[PDB]
């Protein structure tokens, strides 16, 4: 179908995917936030709560440990605003437009909750709140940081300590070097040595 939502034409295809036809980026990014909220508001709400450490407010005490970890490792709204203030002004404005579009759907849905707020909000008895650009950064962090954050150094320290206790330091060091190597020269690589030449090493 094809509809106009404010100043943007939205075509939703047979799979429901929205194709946004805007006259400029400001309008485009507001529509992008709006359609994502139309399609996924409860998911967005919970992803944001994940980063804020406010999941337990909805799902109870079994999420307090997770929320603790999130507040411990995360950033305050002011710290995120400082991040946003260091972007190119146009980029910051487009993230603000995206948040405005999510907010526009929130406002529409709170006005007609029986048709526009999904079952989870009814079951859990709460309303979505309005969004700011800092909340958009939180949506990025809650997932992208997962691929980067790990404590494998501490697991390694524990492996080595337990092996040293069991087998003595000399043997434990050798075992550890086979478990977690410095550099396996035979590991398959995305760039092969013959794919390009590093001039400085001389050919």
């Amino acid at each position: 179908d094809q509809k106009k939502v404010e100043n943007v034409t939205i075509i939703r295809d047979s799979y429901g995917v929205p194709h946004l036809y805007a006259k400029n980026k400001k309008d485009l990014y507001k529509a992008y936030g709006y359609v994502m909220a139309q399609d996924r508001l409860f998911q967005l709400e919970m992803f944001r709560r994940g980063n804020e450490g406010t999941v337990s407010e909805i799902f109870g005490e079994e999420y307090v440990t997770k929320d603790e970890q999130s507040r411990r490792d995360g950033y305050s709204d002011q710290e995120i605003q400082t991040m946003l203030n260091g972007l190119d002004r146009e980029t910051k404005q487009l993230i603000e437009q995206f948040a405005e579009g999510i907010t526009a759907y929130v406002n529409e849905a709170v006005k007609a909750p029986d048709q526009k707020l999904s079952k989870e909000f009814h079951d859990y008895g709460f309303l979505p709140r309005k969004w700011k650009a800092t909340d958009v950064v939180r949506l990025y962090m809650v997932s992208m940081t997962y691929f980067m954050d790990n404590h494998q150094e501490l697991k390694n320290a524990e492996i080595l300590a337990r092996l040293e206790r069991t087998y003595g330091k000399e043997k434990a060091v050798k075992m550890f070097d086979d478990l977690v190597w410095k550099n396996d020269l035979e590991a398959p690589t995305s760039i092969q040595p013959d794919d390009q030449t590093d001039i400085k090493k001389e050919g």
Binding site: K25, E68, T91, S118, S190
Partner: protein
């Protein structure tokens, strides 16, 4: 996550190709959000992770892009030396320093449905948050991210990648991204490019970077390397790049996480598929994805070793002769082509049992004491490099097993697997076929917080991206096909009615069918 980029010289049509396969689990609503973005001078179709104001998997008018997790070394742990007289003080640059104590207040929904307050206290040092504290050993562990405070700059980098119109602009965006990903590029002129993006610390040369760094001040980071030192290539001579989270380049290191970058690595499925063909097209890329999705990954290195050992003894053991025949005939997959709910090759059930037996005989004695931490290394889902080196007799630092012991393990594991199958199933491999494993698109993703109600529709388990795009960059525009399960729309009405678009891509996903990649508005209007 897997990815491929094919340059002109390796492409059947002469056009660069791109394949995406981010592995972010299978949830409903999905982890991905598909969209089309069109404003003057900016036309882009694809998906990004939910909540992101940008596309990660797809194409603009000028380039296709994708990403895989880098596994590069952007988190370090610091071992803080605590004051024996005060466990909230740590020694740093010549003096005792006070930790920052914080208490956070959590509003919690009680089992009575009413609010309840819980407070928790955590600590930070100059290095970062304290993740582990051991007063009796006078040590605490803190955590530093190389990307701290630059997450918004990484968002801007990704938006710039969306707006890029050429490789210069894409590379500029890549140079600004501060977290550890691989980025892939393909354009309409046949070029491809690969970048291991991220801000990588310059570490002390006096420490072993597989372990925590002493936090006393002598071993701090000395800045961050230049982007030119990040692994990258434009138009590599072999004409393609494949990746399945594997090592970027021969001398690139990742410290504590080297366990994912060993000689035995699952990217081999993609390498094998590309090397076995001369020029490739999108249909070939799909066949390679299918292979990787259903492969028993231990086959690449361990099936030849098993066959060699059995062949040595087959003249005196007809069960070994039979297994050699069945193993050689087997295409290394656990697949269900006739949709009967059983994996098609009965010898795959033997091979699975053989592998489990072999891993346990290799390591139960020696590593049982650390199994809660080492099983995920020695039987890692990306490969089992150490096991391979031990069984094949290649050099290791420690002699885990003698050559005679290694051979005995291979044989005993075979005999025990045979005995179990004979007792529980029968004599012939067709009787051994195992029932398929299934998966559903559930309510809880890798963020470990439920975000919806899930789905109960069972589909065969696949070692596969949560979405896939197959894109050919023709001179006129990007073309191709994709799938983004379970469906576009996560809405469930208060009366229980699922959106018509909640799970209308699940059959496509399960059945290796796709929907067209839409770029030209004339096509979008008919889609």
């Amino acid at each position: 996550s897997n990815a491929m980029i094919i340059g002109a010289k390796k492409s059947k049509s002469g056009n660069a190709l791109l394949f995406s396969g981010p592995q972010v689990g299978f949830v409903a609503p999905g982890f991905l959000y598909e969209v089309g973005l069109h404003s003057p001078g900016f036309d882009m179709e694809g998906s990004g992770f939910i909540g992101y104001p940008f596309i990660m998997f797809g194409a603009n008018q000028h380039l296709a892009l994708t990403a895989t997790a880098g596994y590069g070394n952007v988190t370090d742990i610091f071992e803080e030396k605590l004051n024996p007289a005060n466990s909230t003080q740590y020694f740093y640059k010549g003096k005792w320093r006070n930790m920052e104590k914080r208490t956070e207040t959590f509003i919690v929904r009680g089992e009575d449905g009413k609010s309840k307050k819980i407070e928790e206290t955590f600590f930070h040092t100059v290095h970062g948050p304290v993740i582990s504290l051991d007063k009796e050993k006078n040590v605490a562990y803190s955590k530093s991210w190389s990307f701290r405070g630059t997450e918004a700059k990484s968002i801007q980098a990704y938006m710039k990648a969306n707006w890029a119109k050429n490789v210069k602009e894409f590379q500029q965006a890549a140079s600004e991204f501060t977290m550890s990903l691989n980025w892939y590029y393909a354009d309409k002129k046949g070029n491809i490019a690969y970048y291991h993006v991220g801000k990588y610390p310059i570490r002390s040369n006096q420490i072993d970077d597989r372990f925590p760094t002493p936090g006393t001040g002598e071993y701090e980071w000395k800045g961050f390397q230049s982007f030119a030192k990040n692994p990258q290539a434009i138009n590599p001579k072999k004409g393609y790049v494949v990746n399945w989270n594997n090592k970027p380049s021969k001398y690139w290191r990742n410290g504590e996480y080297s366990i994912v970058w060993g000689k035995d690595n699952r990217v081999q499925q993609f390498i094998n598929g590309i090397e076995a063909r001369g020029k490739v097209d999108l249909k070939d890329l799909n066949e390679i994805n299918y292979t990787a999705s259903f492969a028993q990954l231990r086959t690449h290195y361990f099936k030849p070793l098993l066959i060699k050992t059995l062949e040595k003894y087959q003249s005196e053991n007809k069960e070994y002769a039979y297994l050699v025949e069945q193993l050689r005939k087997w295409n290394n997959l656990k697949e269900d082509k006739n949709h009967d709910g059983y994996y098609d090759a009965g010898v795959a059930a033997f091979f699975d049992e053989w592998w489990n037996n072999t891993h346990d005989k290799l390591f139960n004695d020696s590593l049982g004491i650390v199994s809660d931490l080492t099983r995920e290394i020695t039987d890692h889902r990306m490969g089992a490099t150490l096991a391979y080196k031990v069984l094949s007799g290649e050099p290791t630092n420690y002699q885990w097993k003698s050559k005679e012991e290694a051979e005995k393990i291979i044989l005993e594991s075979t005999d025990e697997a045979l005995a179990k199958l004979h007792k529980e199933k029968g004599e012939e491999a067709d009787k051994w076929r195992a029932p398929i494993k299934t998966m559903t698109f559930g309510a809880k993703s890798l963020i470990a917080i439920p975000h919806g109600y899930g789905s109960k529709t069972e589909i065969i388990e696949m070692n596969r991206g949560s979405e896939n795009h197959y894109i050919e960059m023709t001179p006129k525009q990007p073309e191709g096909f994709n799938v983004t399960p379970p469906g576009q729309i996560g809405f469930i009405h208060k009366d229980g009615t699922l959106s018509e678009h909640y799970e209308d891509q699940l059959s496509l996903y399960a059945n290796w069918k796709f929907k067209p990649f839409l770029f030209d508005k004339k096509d979008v209007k008919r889609a």
